[PDB]
């Protein structure tokens, strides 16, 4: 059956990065078209796979991963790659199998006040493991005084608003990503496509 | 079937090409290290822009650039029979 | 620096292409199965063309074509940063 | 007369960072021993002063400069940088005639317990003029929703402490810094060297 | 530039060669049937010997038989401006 | 069964042959571009002559060198099993 | 039968280039000894056929054309040439197929009183068709004056002797030409010719 | 004085290339106005002389050489040159110490009909000596017969019309060439410019 | 005062100038073979005309090139200041 | 291949050059009186860079100017073929 | 006296010196942009170290290297006569 | 890479130094004072020899020493990355 891609690509609301939404795909087959739609891709992406042969893949679940972050930090939506964004709110395990896809949404997300609605983790004890996620929302204690739940100084509140204008640069403006993660039956090298 | 490949910079490439295809509704430029489990990556054009700009090419590395028409009706990727190893410098 | 092919026929391919270079005694064209490790064909033109044809590819295989500009001065030989695979 | 370098660069307590010690010294002839028994440095540099005829400068003052920063924090103490320190910290004038004097000063300020006494300015409305000075603690405003002055989600207390750690890199260590601002007597050709 | 050929028995070709590039790495001579759609052999010897022996040719068979200077920087195959046309 | 080629000049080659010929009255030396519509030429030498110089070739094109031994009891041509191709400089 | 080469080629007295002799010759064996007993040549050429394989070349006739020329102008007996001799004298074809046989003939034809009595056309009103011969002797009119049929200014006799002399250089000396065109009955490739 | 180059330059009859006018010009300043109007000019070639230093030649007197030739033919107006205009109508030497101005006449010397009245020597039985003239009209023995001063087979009238008209090749028309040639008191090297 | 040299060809060079003269009635562009006592040729652009194209160069010679612009009121030739040597191959 | 040259200052002078190498490492700018039995000025400049300034020519002398484009791999020079020659006056 | 500068890196020096003086307290390598208003940059070793080592220098610019001798007990700084002017590659 | 100074005597300067070029057909040395527009100075050493002396230098001024690999072919000086910069006795 086709991919519920509609629902990932087409969602009316995207999850802040640190609420990343996953969606359990059953063994479906990619309309490419739905896909395609959404051109310019600032990232399509794919790791151990070739991205015009998803439907060559032999897998059972697709997982698709979607939230909103900024721009420059797409970059760190790859393996192997640190910052606020890997560290603390999403991170690709380095044995990734799957495609990310981020186009702009500047159109959607932003808004001329400033969009906040959208938070990600600035501040974590540790690096988050791999598909991870965290939602806590403890405060942060960053120095040798105990916050005793207060807010202040080292006190941090863990999460922290984007601020998306459609004024800002374009490395600042709100993209959408979706991460598809494919778990492979064999081998990228075996075929199960569609007869 | 043509394909015509020009450097504007060594790490950015201009690509044009013609191939006998009936009703494409999308071209797709894939492009990526040679062998490596490096990163594959698309560039989508509609099916009526027959160039494209690849750009952000890490220097020094073989990239393997292929050209993919999509049929939606098929949904299918038909290969260009021509591809281009670029070396960045 | 720019690289023209076109397919004349599915085992014909004609050769264009523009190559910096400061002086230029031939261009050598090398071509062969993807695979490496098996014969090599190579055509030789003088630097004075900029086109070449590829004739008697065999059918179904993977070839790669790469252009070298050579100059006498030094036996320098330097590869045209773009190189072409073709599928019979 | 010999400077009051010795105060300067032997102080038990230096500053931190965003309430910077400036002295002023009346024109007094540098003793290179105090500045040379500090070595190993990080960076001596000097713009448009030679560091070694330091004496033959005519200053009616020399402004000292001091406070503790990461050691690589210390790329931001030259004109024209960027960055938390440079930006929210200390600014250095494009034009700055004078010399950055740092020294790692792990074995003094680092702690094993962590020492936290240090402060640096994390958040602020706008970048700092150079030489400006901010010791205020207003709550910044990250966010949409004003703070009344209670730290929370998008209110940040705008001081965070440094974490400094014998078993720090090299890189996180605390470098004590001295920024030696010259007044240049008019025209820098003049010679005043001591007899 | 030369090139030398000794035919000793009908079937095994002595080949001798001296060309002005200095770079060579390893000198490929290259044989096969005519045109023949049909395999062409490699034989590598070092840039250091300039003779080789092609042994095994079938008989009344038209082979050509090139001599390559092959330079590892990049892959190139120079063909030695004298080729071989044997028939055993 | 011996053949030694020489390019004297980008343009000049000096030949030696040797053919196991019982005798022979002239050696053919008979050269042209490989595969075209262009002339063939020979050049006759008496069979006491086992070298031969060709001369003024165009630059740039594969020319084909064959030696014909000439037996005047029955006129015939019998070729040299070694043949020559050269591409002029 | 064999072909009488001999006439041909043995022939005491040589066509002029205006005047040069047609033989046809019936199929017959080529004796190459006979040919070659004439060595060595300015050319021998072939065009479309291999001068080896002229026996096997099947045919109903080949055509004889015998004159002289200079050295020089041996040149221009080729397809598509251009020269005195090509334009005014003797038009070889473009798709010419047969051989052009040239010898030194300064023994035979050169005296030290200069042999005179070969011709050639100098002048013609337009270029020569392929294999035509042009015996007029009517005066070339080069002037925007009528001749009437006299020599003079601009009024030039067409035909002008060769000054051939043992002493002039190798390009200048006589040599006589053998053009050998095939009509032919078959193409070289076939198996046709003597058992 | 101001040379008589007008003269030379604007006349309305050129030479004729066997009948080629010399005007002798005593020591004379170059009005260049007069040579650059004509411009462009297929040659202004000048030998052992700077072209813009003509006014500083140290010279007594200047010989002006004027004669029609073809286009083709201005090639052969150099010194050390050969060709029928070279050898049988205007022979510089090796060593001349001048300048050779040549410019396209086809408006002025061509007719539609054909100008039949500029002549050129087509024989002459030894070459010219530098700057020698040869205007004789004697019928030219080619042939062993002597010619009886009457023309004929092998006895050419020498001077042959050249067609001029003003469709043909650019190479075909008419070009008026000036040659220059100085009597130099002095090596060029040498100044007498106007004072 | 400036100048601009393109080499179109190996034998031909396209020259561009701005000189600081007023009433420059001719542009006379020289070039010659260095030394040797070789040829110098003159080509004359009207001073409207501040191109010019040299052709013809023989293939492998060292030519020096020098604008002058001449005025008719002195009548006198003023050197650019800037000169070429090219190098044809 | 392009080489531009204006004459900012009687004494300084102002050189672009468009010099088709396939990859250049240095340029080398090299100056000096035209006696060439001279002192020689050199400017090194990174292959990027195909803008240069020379400054402080002796004022009344000919000076000759000559680009080199250099390239480590193979101690490769290559002579730009255009020279200039300035009269500094 | 003596100044060994070896290039080990093409942003990096290493210096070795001598100069004869009697108890020199610290050894001063000062080292910076030529020319344009700069940073002037020291490493200060102690007066038993002969050699130094200088890194991240900017590509492509030229810098100039100095060595100074301090005495404490005059509060004075020697020059080395000998100075270093390096480009980096 | 490097570059070796001795003040062998106030005025006698040694010079030793390493460059990776080969294609070095003269060393040339090249010593003049800082821009007092006095007379450059070149000491030419045969391309074997990587040492020279410096002598007859005035007392008490400033010198700029070069060392220029020379190549014949095409007059290239390709300056030596270091500099020597020497203030006499």
């Known amino acids: 059956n086709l991919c519920p891609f509609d629902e990932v690509f087409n969602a009316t609301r995207f999850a802040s990065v640190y609420a990343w939404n996953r969606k359990r795909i059953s063994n479906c087959v990619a309309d490419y078209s739905v896909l395609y739609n959404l051109a310019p891709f600032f990232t399509f992406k794919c790791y151990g796979v070739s991205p015009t042969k998803l439907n060559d893949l032999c897998f059972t679940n697709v997982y698709a991963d979607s939230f909103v972050i900024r721009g420059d930090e797409v970059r760190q939506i790859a393996p192997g790659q640190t910052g606020n964004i890997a560290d603390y709110n999403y991170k690709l395990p380095d044995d990734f199998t799957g495609c990310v896809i981020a186009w702009n949404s500047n159109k959607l997300d932003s808004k001329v006040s400033g969009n906040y609605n959208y938070l990600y983790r600035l501040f974590r004890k540790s690096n988050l493991k791999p598909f991870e996620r965290d939602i806590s929302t403890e405060i942060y204690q960053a120095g040798n005084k105990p916050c005793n739940g207060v807010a202040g100084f080292n006190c941090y509140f863990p999460l922290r608003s984007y601020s998306f204008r459609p004024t800002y640069g374009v490395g600042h403006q709100p993209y959408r990503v979706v991460v598809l993660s494919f778990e492979l039956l064999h081998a990228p090298a075996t075929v199960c496509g569609p007869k | ?89």
């Open chain 2, 1 to 89: 079937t043509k394909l015509e490949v020009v450097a504007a910079t060594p790490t950015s490439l201009l690509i044009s090409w013609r191939m006998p295809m009936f009703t494409v509704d999308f071209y797709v430029i894939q492009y990526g290290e040679t062998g490596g489990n490096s990163p594959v990556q698309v560039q989508v054009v509609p099916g009526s822009t027959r160039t494209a700009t690849i750009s952000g090419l890490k220097p020094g590395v073989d990239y393997t650039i292929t050209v993919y028409a999509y049929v939606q009706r098929d949904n299918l990727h038909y290969p260009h029979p021509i591809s281009i190893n670029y070396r960045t410098g």
